[PDB]
Amino acid sequence: SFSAQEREYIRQGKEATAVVDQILAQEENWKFEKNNEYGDTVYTIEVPFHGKTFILKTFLPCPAELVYQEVILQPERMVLWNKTVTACQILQRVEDNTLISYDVSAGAAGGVVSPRDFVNVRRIERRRDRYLSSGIATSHSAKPPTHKYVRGENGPGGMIVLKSASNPRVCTFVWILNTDLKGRLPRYLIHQSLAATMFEFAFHLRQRISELGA
């Protein structure tokens, strides 16, 4: 038993997950975009309806299970160490695998790209060799857009932790990000701000993992 609205949220989470699996199977076709001194690499891939999608890939010196807990399962707690986001509230839960959240991004690009708020549905799956949280924009009557923030809108994307088949003390983290921030800044500037936000995110994750092992 689920209302028609809860079934629509469940379908949206499953459709986002199908796109994420598709992007992950097209790894050989990712286009290198940028990397940094820590070896964090950002790629892009052109996806059928949502367009250009960014992908951060970073290896982490800890077991998959741990990242899964800090990033994929404690979304509300992430706000404390993940400085690229200033708020996260779960508005509603459907079954055990799908959640509807409200999220506010921190200002970015040295203040050139202002904060955005978002309403997302996301779909957590624990598999044999990986853990995923896939999502996409949705609507929720408790969080209509307001004058306080531009209401950004995520296309399909998510965060994935890939278990290492050869060394269980390490894992690989992948963030697939497709978002429309709206407004009128030129697209190249938004893109540079997204890449930069992904490296800051990796920098906070790495930091969080280190304090959690000391």
From Swiss-Prot:
Cellular location(s): Late endosome membrane
UniProt topological domain (Cytoplasmic) ranges: 1-214
Residues in START domain copies: 1-214
PTM comment: Phosphorylation of the FFAT motif leads to conformation changes. Additional phosphorylations around the core FFAT motif (QFYSPPE) are not essential but strengthen the interaction with MOSPD2, VAPA and VAPB.
Its biological purpose: Sterol-binding protein that mediates cholesterol transport from the endoplasmic reticulum to endosomes. The sterol transport mechanism is triggered by phosphorylation of FFAT motif that leads to membrane tethering between the endoplasmic reticulum and late endosomes via interaction with VAPA and VAPB. Acts as a lipid transfer protein that redirects sterol to the endosome at the expense of the cell membrane and favors membrane formation inside endosomes. May also mediate cholesterol transport between other membranes, such as mitochondria membrane or cell membrane.
Domain notes: The FFAT motif mediates interaction with VAPA, VAPB and MOSPD2.
Protein name per its UniProtKB record: StAR-related lipid transfer protein 3
Annotated organism of origin: Homo sapiens (Human)
Parent-protein residues present: 230 to 443 of 445
